[PDB]
Write a protein that binds this ligand. Structure first.
Ligand SMILES: CCCCCCO[C@@H]1O[C@H](CO)[C@H](O)[C@H](O)[C@H]1O[C@@H]1O[C@@H](C)[C@@H](O)[C@@H](O)[C@@H]1O
Ligand SMILES: O=c1ccn([C@@H]2O[C@H](COP(=O)(O)OP(=O)(O)O)[C@@H](O)[C@H]2O)c(=O)[nH]1
Ligand SMILES: [Hg+2]
Ligand SMILES: [Hg+2]
Ligand SMILES: [Hg+2]
Ligand SMILES: [Hg+2]
Length: 263
């Protein structure tokens, strides 16, 4: 709505690709977020003017509560810094949640293990796994109605090699000649509405597979991929946003490693 203020930055070169080594836009015109493709100053202005609030959801059950401290501490240094953030930690051990110091405008809720609550408190929802840590900037450049993240182990793979559910009996089934990318189940999100639609669809699909006595090869991730195949994401995040340096190193194609597995 509101107009952006005067800003000074490099023009942008119509005749110069921002990247010559990677695909920066999908066939359905959704941007693929790589370092160098965005001016964070412009994006920060756009989202702050909207007083955007981002919700970050994580599940920490059983032995996984041990990952919370590093997860939250690093998020405080790299996730949506400058914007309103609301952390939602779902755990079976509320008292085991570390007391992490948060910056201003950021809050955390412990939910022991509602839907409409999200719609009321945040504009976007970012759903990630807790056994990770932020190592670099993860900001508003990822926000959009719906986004998936390229899985680090298959970004350069052909569709036939993707570990999609290949059994026709499963609702998550995807044949060999179908598929755009293999998205990681550990990092996805979008507007509250779109995220609830995705989780709702996947919940029902999994219920169907259950009754039929079948369980997708990679569970939630398998259904996520089926959903995103049929409902194209409005933005796709590159592997910079979901990596594992111990297992994959640090390729030249990745100018930054932002969110990674904890060794
Ligand atoms: C062909 C080489 C690929 C190496 C990565 C395999 O990653 C696993 O992929 C499956 C789907 O095929 C699941 O997504 C699984 O969760 C992935 O493992 C997890 O992510 C990788 C990157 C690594 O951090 C593992 O320790 C995780 O368990
Ligand atoms: O067999 C499993 C593996 C993971 N999880 C849950 O998934 C979350 C994060 O998943 P994972 O360990 O697969 O994360 P990744 O290494 O993919 O980041 C954990 O907090 C657990 O609550 C689970 O319930 N069962
Ligand atoms: Hg979520
Ligand atoms: Hg689904
Ligand atoms: Hg599900
Ligand atoms: Hg899903």
């Amino acid at each position: 709505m509101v107009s952006l203020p005067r800003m000074v930055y490099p023009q942008s070169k119509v005749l110069t690709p921002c990247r010559k080594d990677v695909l920066v836009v999908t066939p359905w015109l959704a941007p693929i977020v790589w370092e160098g493709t965005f001016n964070i100053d412009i994006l920060n202005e756009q989202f702050r003017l909207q007083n955007t609030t981002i919700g970050l959801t994580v599940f920490a059950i059983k032995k996984y509560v041990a990952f919370l401290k590093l997860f939250l501490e690093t998020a405080e240094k790299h996730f949506m810094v400058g914007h309103r953030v609301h952390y939602y930690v779902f755990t079976d051990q509320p008292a085991a949640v570390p007391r992490v110091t948060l910056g201003t405008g950021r809050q955390l809720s412990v939910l022991e293990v509602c839907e409409r609550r999200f719609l009321s408190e945040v504009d976007y929802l970012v759903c990630v796994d807790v056994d990770m840590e932020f190592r670099d900037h993860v900001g508003v450049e990822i926000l959009t109605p719906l986004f998936g993240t390229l899985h680090p182990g298959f970004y350069g793979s052909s569709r036939e090699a993707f570990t999609y559910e290949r059994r026709p009996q499963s609702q998550a089934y995807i044949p060999k000649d179908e598929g755009d990318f293999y998205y990681l189940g550990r990092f996805f999100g979008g507007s509250v509405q779109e995220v609830q639609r995705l989780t709702r669809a996947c919940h029902q699909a999994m219920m169907v597979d259950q009754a039929n006595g079948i369980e997708a090869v990679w569970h939630d991730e398998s259904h996520l991929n089926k959903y995103l195949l049929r409902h194209k994401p409005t933005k796709v995040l590159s592997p910079e946003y979901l990596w594992d340096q111990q297992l994959l190193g640090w390729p030249a194609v990745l100018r930054k490693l932002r969110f990674t597995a904890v060794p």
